[PDB]
Amino acid sequence: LERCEREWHELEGEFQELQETHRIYKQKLEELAALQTLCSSSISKQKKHLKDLKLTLQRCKRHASREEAELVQQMAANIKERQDVFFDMEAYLPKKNGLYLNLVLGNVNVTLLSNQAKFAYKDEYEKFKLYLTIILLLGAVACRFVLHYRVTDEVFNFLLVWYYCTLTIRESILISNGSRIKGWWVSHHYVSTFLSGVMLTWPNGPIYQKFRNQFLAFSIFQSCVQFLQYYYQFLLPFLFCGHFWQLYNAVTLFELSSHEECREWQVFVLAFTFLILFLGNFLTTLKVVHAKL
Amino acid sequence: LERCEREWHELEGEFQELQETHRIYKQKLEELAALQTLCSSSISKQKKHLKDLKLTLQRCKRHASREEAELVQQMAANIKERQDVFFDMEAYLPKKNGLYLNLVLGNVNVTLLSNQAKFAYKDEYEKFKLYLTIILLLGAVACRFVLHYRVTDEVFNFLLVWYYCTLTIRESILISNGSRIKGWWVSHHYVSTFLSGVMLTWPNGPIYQKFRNQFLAFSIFQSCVQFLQYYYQFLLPFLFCGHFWQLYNAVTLFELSSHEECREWQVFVLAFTFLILFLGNFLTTLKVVHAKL
């Protein structure tokens, strides 16, 4: 066991070496905290001077001599340069979280702060989306054709609502990390996870047994659009057809609310979710077309 | 507008100063990456030498002379010291996540790595738990006494299942950050969020209208126990009474499955969740009593 003793001697040497490295590490951590305080002060002073200078550009915008007109145009080009460069250093800098991520994960720092790390996280997000849309597809056209029971549709709706919550957490991380994808999309995911829930708690009458087929076909259309929307990371006509299929569902269910003598409250709170999810995404696509135009 | 020009001159000076600080910051980031690679190598070599040395202690454990017996006892005291000290530097060190947090948040680093930051995060977690158990309490005894409708019970069950998922994400962060609270508790939260779901999808017959009252009283007992379990951060007798109330629910619903001529599948998948949640938490408490003893 003397071998263990001499090995211990070697590990004590390595232990004091790692103690040295760990206390150097703690010194570096204190230096990092100091520079984070300094950069936060820099954020404050930079944004203060930004609002002051755009106020100066605002009240200087009124008409005067040609020389100050050249000065205003020149300062406009520079102020565009100002926002681009401060967007760069505000991208790398670690940043306070939003509100929803604050409400779920609490006060914790999730900023990668690295270009290649952001790229890798985007690839991971794309891979996760493809995998779970494969599982959902093998369940939409599957549930429609083999198993016609209530319990499997409940399980499928649990999987859809869980999937939508995971996507909204992921996209909150993605927005607080890097590029701004803020717009219709995050509110689209919120209203779509609300839509998942209403279908689940129907009282399983004949009316659910009629609306089930159109809902499952609509899901198949949604899975195919998201799948082809990833292989690209063409798409527009199938997106228009998705909007029109959504309109088909909305009109059919809205007419269905009048047809039966007695209505649940859940056939009429559910149609208007489809209609809001029509006017939102379709018009956003035409805005992207105008962005293309 | 010449004031803006001279201010610009000052901001260009501050801009090159912040460019200097930012490139120093990037140099420090590269140094951090290098020391993280070094400390990961240290992790590998330390754990390798740990398994080798505990193997040496294992096959050296066999009976021999008194001198090596003193050596084995002495090395046992030191190896306990070895695990304590390596637990310390493996606590501060940033660490790879588990599996569930990997499945939800993806590959992202959530290690605070700071004692006071961990303490602050624990206080935030305690505050969040108290606030949402207040909201749930004002809903359990509330739903029971004023509003007897299906939709409000669905909303309350949505709030409970959302609350349980948020707690399991928070405790995953807490375990991957600091102390080991791994045991019955995280699996308890998983089976309890499974329990929330089964109650929600009942077909609203008379039988649900009978089981509702005992479920809501049980929730009130649960909210009071969690509230008193926080004010401490006494508890044992009310915890025993919670277990026995859980047994009351289990026996009543198990007898209820036989009483009615026709049974849904959801009165018999739901009772055994209560029974598993009885044998688990009660026996864990007596283990804590034995830990006290």
Residue numbers in the entry:
A (entry chain B), B (entry chain A): 5 to 237, 270 to 329
Question: Any passages from the paper?
Answer:
A recent study identified TMEM120A, also named TACAN, as an MSC that contributes to mechanosensitive currents in nociceptors. TMEM120A/B were originally identified as nuclear membrane localized protein that plays an important role in adipocyte differentiation. Here, we present the cryo-electron microscopy (cryo-EM) structures of both human TMEM120A and TMEM120B at overall resolutions of 3.7 Å and 4.0 Å, respectively. The cryo-EM maps of TMEM120A and TMEM120B reveal a shared homo-dimeric assembly, which is about 80 Å in height and 85 Å in width.
Despite sequence similarity, no mechanically evoked current was detected for heterologously expressed TMEM120B, a homolog of TMEM120A2. We carried out a comparative structural investigation between TMEM120A and TMEM120B, attempting to uncover their potential difference in mechanosensing property. Most of the residues in the dimer interface are highly conserved between TMEM120A and TMEM120B. The CCD is the less conserved region, but the overall structures of CCD between the two proteins are the same. From the structural perspective, there is hardly any hint for the difference between TMEM120A and TMEM120B in sensing mechanical force. We also examined TMEM120B using the same system, and the current mediated by TMEM120B was slightly smaller than that by TMEM120A at the same voltage level. By contrast, no significant difference was detected between cells transfected with TEME120A/B and the empty vector-transfected cells. In this study, the almost identical structures between TMEM120A and TMEM120B, and our electrophysiological characterizations do not support the role of TMEM120A as an MSC.
